[PDB]
């Protein structure tokens, strides 16, 4: 919009706390604009806080509204670039007062180079690329700006104020320098951008994305009344009565308190405001706005030096002002408040209305909260100026008239996005009927986003809804059973779930239409079982204070935190220790020394180590940590497992060291706690020639087909292998068994990093050394600066040790699960329906994982099913005696056709009945007779 | 076709993937099939009626049960399933384990709330107040009285629900351990569905 | 508010991870709840089910 | 390997000089959550633990 | 244990201007203040010896 701007160079100006290196962090202050139009496209006036320029291929002036002859301005200098760079000073051509600072800070004029200053909320920096200058001055306000610009420049010669607070994001490179920027209220993408620290954020749903509502403050509720005046100021309370004024519910002028004498007040002004008349007092603001507690105020008139009076000692929490010279001689008054808890509010300005039908946030009698408020017909208490129904804030009476509040339902949007042009707006609270979207209440309230369709989830905006249509692959799942899809335009569906098939087959008697499956499908169910965390062995003495001894005299004071911290984490360190004892006493087998080869089963070089298997070296190749940190180093190091050094990081108190046994070091099949991979399907008296011979048996134990030659053992051999080197394509997304290990990786790295954050940040606390606190503050305020950061870092470690408690605890029953999932289902071949898989079971090999256990269990889910005709058995004589025949380890079926046959259990390869697949037993139930003699000896 | 995903000052509550008391059971989208765990794996099977006939000879209490073995397990089903209505929240050890489950979240949520309403001994709930009145530095302590306060209250919320989430993933294995193995299948464990 | 610890980036990492656990672990459960009942649908006679 | 320190921010390692000279604001940096490198009187000086 | 090392400030360190003229008082007759922020200050040339 403007002929010269250089936005590409404002990140030379942005600035984070403290060094943070290659991520992005969101940073609020006083930082240029975006307009092309504030830059200018040559004297500038304008009122900001703060001020910005740059030079393409400069005298400022910065001042209150009123000066005085005691105030603080500044004027930076500039003449014709190289040769007369700059001059700064703080001071009133003529040096008539007093002069802060004489700093020169010469620059470098180049193609490209950007500065400013701010002086938001008295934060004076003065910025430089190289070096900032920061200075907070308590008689400070600035809000006047006269810019000026030397005679001629080649382009556009550019400056900006800026008007008020941003909170953009920042990232910065290697070295700590901000490359990329995006302001937060620029646009509508980059205000979810400085909500979720990221720059290019991936399509998702994002929830709980606020919408910033402006305040009201209302101190006092009922119309307010005056007060009497400024007292007699006669003279001294013990020569003659005197008395002091009472200020309970009064509105104010605090400059009838003085005579006019036409501007001669010199202390009470303030340099923008008028008359605060309170110079100096103790614990609380010189600065008097909006309303103060009420006080009895104390007046005296006494006799002076030349122009110079001293304030007296005073109550720590009352207040001193005082006015009138110029007159001539040395006499004055001065009075005192002293703002005792009175509670009847003294102040001007009796406050109007709010206006009903707008969600601004509210603080009535000391309470926030933040609705929308309307007006109410039912009058309650004469007490109470807000009432409440159980937690809820419903009625408050403001200005004598009842307003009844209800809540806010327009704050929270969860944002669904696949890219900058579409993206989808959900409330989840805000149903939209169309009665009340054109309601008289909700004529203010309404937005161009609020015109969507009321949903169960709530109301979506710019996006379609219809539920009629499912879908399976729920990538992003969004709550009551919907999902948004993010194929094309952005849609919301509803998901839904592969069915089951229960493999109990149920006894058949009476016959009937059966349906038996016609063939099966391998399907492999990972399942993650967490099973380890590295054990702790803090130390809460160097941990919440370092080498100072000044804390370890005064740590033990509270409440014998540090030996409940150190035999907490004892405690429960030796449950760990001796849960996964038992772990390993329970997966250390006795496998045979025939070790039975396989044919056509890759199971040697996947799940066999090489000393980690090929599966689980691949698993934590799959795993991405979130930065560098320690838990990164702690990871990567255990990741590749490189012999013969350790990883078991110590830092400042906290020794973390690994469990008895741990998981993602030992491989699952070799080592010493060795897992015996044949001993589960060769059984626990072995000799069982081959796997071929094996899968054979199995599949004749559970009943799809009996006698197996190697083309059925063959076809389930392909399966398997085709079926487990599935194990390398997929991803983090789409795979709920990664998803699990991530989550316990993400879990556990943001716990250390919450850990570190509690050492490295000081609590409000001058510094992190307390020494230094020792030497700089009180006898007595710095006790409240030592208990500002000890009881903190106190907070970071009991909440530690509280979150390594609940999962210690989590993993006590989790570990009880994974023994009886190893020796009944890895071990055993589990009786159980859903126990070790879905539907019938086959194998279940396990391998280790990181901090856990992962099964691979293999099952049959069938897929076609046939429907036949099945008797328990069959007679040809009606007799009671008869010679009646019933199926050897099957079922006897009938495709709808004239004659019985045989077929497995939970298979349909139907055969011809003879003698070798028939018991003949007896008319036990009803068999079905089929009136014709047998076609069997 | 409206919501009640409550938001109040920070804290959005939202329904998760599937929501229990929305959806029926056996009906929906996710439907649970009442046949399918009595009538087996392999259907066909005619009635309810020869169902139970073959359940009770299944576990052998009567073999080749008649309609009168059947209908007698029938009055009693339905006189013992009506019973569903005559109890009352004492004396039935399952509708106080939901009441127990109501109170902890409704005074888990007072907690919250309570948290976000008080002044922790504070002058007030408004920083800008707090800010406006009070020194440099007293108003400091004042600042974190009550912002260490709503911390500790909030804190005290995630820990709660951490805990409840640890107990809810190994409670889910014994929930699917128990759906499809005594709901969908008919278990040979003793005390695992029921008494006998 | 972030001088004390790294508490705001520790609550709302946790509940969200908190939260995707029982996302996931809700959707096992109704993984296993939705089955597979026959197009037949069984009549009863005298059970009120 | 003594403990130091820096811009109000105590921490406790062995520091060796180093050869990269980041940034001329931020007398400390920060990788992630560790204290890695740390300028020390205009040189930078790499901070190990 | 491993002792300890402080420090406050990192950047070398220039100097100040000394303590004021120490005039008349600041109602009858201009006295300004003077400020310190970088200074290796001495404590003992604030007065005269
Ligand atoms: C800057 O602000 C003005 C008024 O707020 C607006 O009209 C103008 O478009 C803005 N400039 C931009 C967005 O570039
Ligand atoms: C401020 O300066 C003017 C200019 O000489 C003078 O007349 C006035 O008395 C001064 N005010 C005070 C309070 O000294
Ligand atoms: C600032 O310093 C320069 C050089 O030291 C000097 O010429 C000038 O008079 C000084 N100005 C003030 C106001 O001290
Ligand atoms: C920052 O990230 C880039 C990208 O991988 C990397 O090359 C660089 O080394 C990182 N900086 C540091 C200090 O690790
Ligand atoms: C509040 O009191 C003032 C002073 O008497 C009066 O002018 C004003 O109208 C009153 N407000 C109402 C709503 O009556
Ligand atoms: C305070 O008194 C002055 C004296 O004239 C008057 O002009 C001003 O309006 C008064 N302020 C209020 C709020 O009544
Ligand atoms: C007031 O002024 C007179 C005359 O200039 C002087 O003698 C006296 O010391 C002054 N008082 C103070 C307290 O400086
Ligand atoms: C979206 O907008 C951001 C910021 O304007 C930009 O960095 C990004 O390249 C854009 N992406 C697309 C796909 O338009
Ligand atoms: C709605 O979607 C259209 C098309 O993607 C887009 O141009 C428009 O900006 C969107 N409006 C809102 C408020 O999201
Ligand atoms: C919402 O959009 C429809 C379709 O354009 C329109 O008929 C209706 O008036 C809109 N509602 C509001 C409140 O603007
Ligand atoms: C879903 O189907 C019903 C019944 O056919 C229909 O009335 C409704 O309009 C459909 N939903 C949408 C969003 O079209
Ligand atoms: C989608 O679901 C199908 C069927 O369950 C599954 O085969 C496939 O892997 C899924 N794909 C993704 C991307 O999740
Ligand atoms: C077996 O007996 C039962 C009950 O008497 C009957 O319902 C069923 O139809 C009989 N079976 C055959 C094959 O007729
Ligand atoms: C059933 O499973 C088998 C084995 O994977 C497969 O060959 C067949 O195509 C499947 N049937 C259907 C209808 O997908
Ligand atoms: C199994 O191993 C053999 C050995 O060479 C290999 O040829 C085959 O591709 C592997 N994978 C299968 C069968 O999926
Ligand atoms: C058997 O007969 C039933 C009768 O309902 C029919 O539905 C089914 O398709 C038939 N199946 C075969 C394999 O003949
Ligand atoms: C089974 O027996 C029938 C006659 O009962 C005969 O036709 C058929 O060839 C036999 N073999 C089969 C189905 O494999
Ligand atoms: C032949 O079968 C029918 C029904 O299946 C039944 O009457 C009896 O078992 C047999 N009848 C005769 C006359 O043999
Ligand atoms: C079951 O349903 C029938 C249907 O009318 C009803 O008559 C009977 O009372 C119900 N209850 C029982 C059997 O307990
Ligand atoms: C720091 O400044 C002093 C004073 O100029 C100087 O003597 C000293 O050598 C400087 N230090 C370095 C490392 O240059
Ligand atoms: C301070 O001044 C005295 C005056 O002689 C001098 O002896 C001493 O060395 C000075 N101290 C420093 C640290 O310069």
């Given at each position: 919009g403007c002929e010269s701007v250089d936005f590409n160079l404002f990140n030379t100006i942005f600035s984070t706390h403290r060094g943070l290196s290659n991520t992005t962090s969101v940073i609020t202050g006083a930082y240029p604009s975006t307009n092309k139009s504030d830059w200018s496209c040559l004297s500038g006036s304008g009122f900001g806080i703060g001020l910005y320029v740059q030079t393409p291929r400069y005298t400022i002036a910065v001042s209150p509204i009123h000066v005085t002859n005691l105030t603080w301005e500044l004027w930076i200098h500039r003449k014709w670039g190289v040769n007369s760079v700059v001059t700064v000073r703080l001071c009133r051509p003529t040096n008539a007062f007093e002069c802060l600072i004489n700093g020169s800070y010469p620059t470098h004029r180049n193609t490209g180079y950007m500065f400013g200053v701010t002086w938001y909320n008295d934060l004076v920096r003065i910025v430089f690329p190289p070096t900032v200058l920061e200075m907070q001055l308590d008689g400070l306000q600035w809000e006047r700006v006269q810019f000026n610009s030397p005679v001629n420049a080649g382009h556009a010669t550019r400056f900006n104020v800026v008007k008020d607070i941003s909170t953009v994001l920042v990232e910065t490179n290697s070295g700590g320098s901000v490359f990329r920027y995006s302001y937060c209220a620029d646009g509508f993408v980059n205000g979810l951008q400085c909500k979720l620290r990221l720059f290019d954020i991936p399509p998702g749903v994002y929830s709980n994305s606020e919408v910033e509502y402006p305040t009201a403050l209302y101190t006092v509720v009922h119309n307010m009344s005056a007060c009497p005046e400024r007292p007699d100021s006669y003279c001294g309370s013990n020569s003659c009565p005197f008395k002091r004024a009472v200020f309970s519910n009064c509105i104010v002028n605090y400059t009838t308190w003085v005579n006019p004498d036409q501007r001669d007040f010199q202390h009470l002004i303030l340099p923008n405001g008028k008359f605060n008349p309170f110079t100096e007092c103790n614990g609380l603001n010189r600065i008097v706005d909006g309303c103060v507690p009420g006080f009895v105020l104390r007046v005296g008139r006494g006799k002076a030096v030349n122009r110079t009076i001293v304030t007296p000692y005073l109550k720590p929490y009352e207040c001193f002002g005082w006015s009138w010279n110029d007159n001539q001689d040395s006499i004055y008054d001065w009075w005192i408040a002293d703002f005792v808890s009175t509670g009847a509010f003294v102040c001007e300005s009796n406050p109007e209305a709010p206006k009903t039908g707008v969600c601004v946030t509210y603080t009535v009698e000391k309470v926030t909260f933040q609705g929308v408020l309307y007006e109410s017909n039912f009058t309650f208490a004469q007490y109470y100026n807000l009432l409440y129904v159980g937690s809820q804030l419903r009625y408050v009476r403001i200005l004598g008239k009842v307003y009844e509040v209800s809540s806010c339902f327009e704050a929270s949007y969860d944002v669904l996005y696949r890219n900058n042009q579409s993206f989808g707006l959900l409330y989840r609270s805000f149903d939209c009927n169309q009665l009340h979207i054109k309601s008289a209440r909700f004529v203010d309230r309404l937005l161009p986003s609020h015109n969507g369709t009321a949903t169960v989830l709530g109301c979506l905006f710019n996006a379609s809804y219809a539920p009629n249509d499912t879908m399976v692959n729920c990538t992003n799942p969004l709550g009551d059973g919907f999902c948004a899809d993010l194929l094309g335009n952005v849609a919301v569906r509803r998901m839904t779930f592969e069915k089951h098939d229960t493999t109990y087959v149920a006894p058949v008697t009476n016959e009937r239409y059966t349906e038996m499956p016609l063939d099966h499908q391998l399907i492999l169910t990972e399942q993650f079982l967490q099973t380890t965390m590295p054990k702790f062995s803090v130390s809460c003495e160097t941990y919440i204070?370092?080498?100072?001894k000044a804390c370890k005299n005064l740590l033990f004071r509270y409440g014998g935190f540090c030996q409940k911290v150190e035999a907490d984490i004892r405690g429960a360190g030796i449950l760990l220790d001796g849960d996964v004892s038992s772990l390993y006493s329970t997966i250390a087998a006795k496998t045979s020394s025939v070790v039975p080869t396989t044919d056509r089963f890759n199971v040697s070089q996947f799940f066999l180590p090489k000393s980690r298997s090929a599966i689980e070296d691949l698993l934590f190749s799959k795993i991405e940590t979130t930065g560098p940190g320690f838990y990164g180093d702690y990871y990567n190091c255990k990741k590749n497992a490189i012999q013969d050094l350790t990883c078991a990081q110590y830092h400042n108190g906290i020794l973390v060291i690994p469990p008895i046994m741990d998981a993602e070091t030992l491989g699952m099949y070799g080592g010493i706690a060795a897992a015996s991979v044949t001993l589960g399907i060769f059984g626990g008296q072995a000799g069982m020639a081959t796997w071929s011979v094996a899968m054979a048996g199995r599949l004749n134990a559970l009943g799809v087909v009996q006698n197996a030659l190697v083309d059925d053992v063959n076809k389930l051999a392909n399966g398997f292998n085709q079926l487990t080197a599935s194990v390398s394509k997929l991803a983090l997304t789409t795979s709920s068994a990664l998803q699990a290990i991530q989550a316990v990786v993400n879990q556990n790295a943001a716990q250390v990093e919450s850990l570190v954050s509690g050492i490295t940040e000081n609590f409000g606390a001058i510094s992190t050394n307390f020494k230094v606190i020792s030497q700089r503050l009180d006898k007595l305020e710095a006790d409240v600066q030592m208990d500002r950061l000890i009881n903190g870092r106190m907070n970071v470690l009991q909440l530690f040790v509280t979150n390594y408690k609940l999962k210690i605890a989590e993993l006590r029953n989790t570990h009880r699960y994974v023994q009886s999932l190893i020796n009944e289902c890895v071990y055993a071949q589990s009786l159980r329906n859903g126990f070790c898989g879905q539907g019938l079971h086959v194998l279940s090999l396990m391998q280790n994982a990181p901090s856990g256990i992962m099964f691979f269990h293999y099952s049959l889910i069938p897929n076609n099913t046939i429907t036949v005709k099945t008797t328990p058995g069959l007679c040809e004589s009606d007799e009671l005696g008869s010679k009646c025949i019933v199926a050897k380890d099957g079922v006897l079926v009938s495709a709808n056709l004239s004659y019985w046959q045989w077929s497995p259990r939970n298979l349909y390869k139907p055969e011809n009945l003879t003698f070798a697949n028939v018991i003949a037993v007896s008319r036990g139930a009803n068999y079905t007779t089929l009136n014709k003699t047998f076609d069997i000896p």
């Open positions: 204070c370092d080498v100072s």
